[PDB]
Design a binder for this molecule. Sequence first.
Ligand code: CL
Ligand code: NA
Ligand code: NA
Ligand code: NA
Lengths: 285, 281
Amino acid sequence: SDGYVVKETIGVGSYSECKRCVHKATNMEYAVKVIDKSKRDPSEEIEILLRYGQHPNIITLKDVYDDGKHVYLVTELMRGGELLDKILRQKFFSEREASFVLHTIGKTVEYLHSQGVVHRDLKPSNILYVDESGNPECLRICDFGFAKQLRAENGLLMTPCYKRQGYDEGCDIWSLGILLYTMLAGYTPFANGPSDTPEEILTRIGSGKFTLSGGNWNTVSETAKDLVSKMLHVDPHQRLTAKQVLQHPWVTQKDKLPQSQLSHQDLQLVKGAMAATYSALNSSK
Amino acid sequence: DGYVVKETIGVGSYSECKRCVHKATNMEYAVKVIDKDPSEEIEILLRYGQHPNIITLKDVYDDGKHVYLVTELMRGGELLDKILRQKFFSEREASFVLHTIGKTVEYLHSQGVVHRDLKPSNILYVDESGNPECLRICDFGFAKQLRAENGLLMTPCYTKRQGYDEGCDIWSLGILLYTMLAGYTPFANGPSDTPEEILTRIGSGKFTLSGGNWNTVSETAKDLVSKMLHVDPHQRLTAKQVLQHPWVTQKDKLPQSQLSHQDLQLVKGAMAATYSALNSS
Ligand SMILES: [Cl-]
Ligand code: NA
Ligand code: NA
Ligand code: NA
């Protein structure tokens, strides 16, 4: 407030608005998440970011303010925009580059799960690039407002080390699964565009069925299909763990992966179908 | 100063503990005065200090020269004072002590924390009742949190030095167990034992589990002690395995007769000499 000048708005949720701000002292660009305390308690979000925000692929918390009415999360500015914008447009993209994306993200989720943290909102729009390079190491997971830290009755933090978290972890993997599905197919598994109704989408999701043939799937590697189908398994307690995903041949034997560009559908269609899919899911939640 | 400092309770080669009284609420606390890096100690206490059996951190001050750790006052004094004197004590009560402590260690280990200084004088009672739930683990100045190269906290699960370090925590539990059962320490006879006598005994990996009192101690307790004190550190039990031992899980089968013990000052003296020998090495 006294040390940042607020610029344009980047995005905006029902409890918070993210905007671009500039540090006065050093004149460097950052992002501030402005949260209305009198509507939400970001308490767990702030703790998680302070504790695990040092992980290279988790957005970094750089300053926290609480003038009383609002809470201000200052973080690194994601200049590279969202994942999908990148991989569906500017950037050369084959199974090889996709495996790196999954590996970077899946590795960060595996770390989080091991610490007893579930994200619960791993939609593609929450995965951003810190810069315009499109390099895997530049990926950041960016919105921990639904994230939950596993706790004992008396508040004690706990690790899976020491059925709701197995259900919650499965949700993080399912999200990874549809992102994977999209990167490979160039379309989303349960929606055809932004105008799909919750009815169409939830029926498809409920059936536990999705296409792994036709279109790109006709040239996509058999082991990628194997992996996607185990990440998207209908019974949440039968999906792979993050660890098992990282141990899949599609992730570990990258030199065997095809290196030809992947076909994809219009970017606005794909992001639209993706938003409709998570809107449908929030509905039944 | 929101506290008024009273008498001194104890000392340490890097600290001095005294009883103080909170001014605002007029309640009694304990302050540890440290001569300035309690950094890793403070982090651990803030993070895990909510565990019922870990001392609770209530306030932290740093005027520059000294650091002030305000914690709960341990009115029950040290473990051994209690169980060797002013408390009825059989294998049943011993199993409760191990269970309370071993449970708190198992939690710590799972979080990537090793204590490294689990001597009986670091285990206190919050009050004079001698109840198990009143046990507190109290000094984390050697404790170490498992971390990645980039500072990331890590648990043993995600992730040979920690298996070695955990084995040291279990070994300490083992000699405490040994003492509660035998009424004397396994590697020293009194406060006058030399580091050479003690380390030779420890090094041999041998100790008495027969004759004398041992003839009336339960077989399963002997079995457990011998696996906690195993000479090869990577062959001792994990904390988890200790809590899964029949001596800990089938308490209704334990004997309930008072345990023989030696003079209290002799035992605490031999215990101090034992850890003094170990710090030396
Ligand atoms: Cl694509
Ligand atoms: Na980071
Ligand atoms: Na979809
Ligand atoms: Na506590």
